[PDB]
């Protein structure tokens, strides 16, 4: 399917085009939102500032997908493909993203995503870039973060339990209020996180000591 | 026994004096090393600038005496009074002051030098040891209640069992410390350099949660 017809289905109120093939596709300023994309292929898609706003994106495929600038709001992508995808300045606010593959993916720079209030578990999140993203409020439970970029995200009240964080860069991350409990952290991010309230086990807490260099 | 009989004793090579009673009096750059002053009343003493380098002055009163730039290296003070001392600039480098009262004490506020000093079971309460050095110092179950501890450097030193209860610890260096079982505000972990210091598991959690964290 091309560009003209799915525009045209949908402006005349068609919402179910799952299992469709858009991949290339040019959808940049498309507006389709309430639209059933479940199972849909959009490798390399240029979605770029489109809005998808509760779209059922679940299972689709979205690797290497421009969607920089888009809006994904209450989006359903649970065990979407983002390999790669491209989506700095994104908002995703609360998308279910759970199990989804964003290994790869870019979330922002020197531009932030917002993510906040999302559902990422078990996610992965993998070598993701998230600098300066919103994550407060998201649910990372189970969430593979290895080496991901953090710098300067923002993780407020967001829950970590169970997550890994082994070689993700943290340096300005805001976890103050987040759930670290059983999180799989480097020494490093004790040195440089702020950690107000955040909570830890036992194990956590010696941790962190020893991260500043206490001997026991 | 006044000044000029002492100093002519001493000059004899007379060492014995103790119990003897030389409150009040000016002794200043007097020279009186390896003297036996033990049970000696000191009270109110100028000593300002004396080498007493090993004497023993076990138990002898030293109170609001003035020892200011003194040498006391490896003297023996075991229990001595020394509640009110100016000791500003004195060096006790490896002396045994343990069990010894120093409440009160000015130690540098130029800093005293305690390095390798034996301070066990020493009351310093209330002391003023900003700048001191007690690097290397044992402090084992001393009382440092409402010390200040401002800039005081206490690498390597033994606070087992001490009580830091309302010490001020600005600028403290505790590196290599062994703090175990110490009493110590959460302030502390915030901040004295705590690098290769020794604690407890109890500790630990105390200094995460001096920083912040939730269990």
Not at 76 to 88: F, M, S, T
Not at 106 to 133: C, F, K, R, V
Not at 137 to 146: E, Q, S, T, V
Request: net charge negative; charged share 20%.
């Amino acid at each position: 399917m091309n560009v003209g017809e799915i525009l045209r289905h949908y402006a005349a109120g068609k919402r179910n085009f799952q299992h469709i093939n858009l991949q290339e596709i040019e959808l940049t300023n498309a507006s389709l939102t309430g639209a059933d994309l479940s199972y849909a292929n959009l490798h390399h898609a240029n979605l770029s500032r489109a809005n998808l706003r509760s779209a059922d994106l679940r299972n689709a495929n979205l690797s290497h997908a421009n969607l920089e600038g888009a809006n994904l709001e209450e989006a359903n992508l649970e065990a979407a493909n983002l390999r790669g995808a491209r989506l700095a300045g994104a908002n995703l606010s609360g998308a279910d993203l759970q199990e989804a593959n964003l290994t790869q993916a870019n979330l922002g720079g020197p531009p932030g995503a917002d993510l906040s209030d999302a559902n990422l578990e078990q996610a992965d999140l993998a070598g993701a870039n998230l600098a300066g993203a919103v994550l407060d409020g998201a649910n990372l439970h189970g969430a593979n973060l290895n080496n991901a970029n953090l710098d300067n995200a923002m993780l407020t009240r967001a829950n970590l339990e169970q997550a890994d964080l082994s070689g993700a860069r943290t340096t300005g991350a805001r976890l103050d209020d987040a759930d670290l409990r059983g999180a799989t952290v480097d020494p490093v991010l004790w040195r440089t996180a702020s950690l107000v309230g955040a909570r830890v086990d036992v194990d956590q807490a010696v941790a962190f000591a020893a991260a500043h260099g206490l001997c026991l």
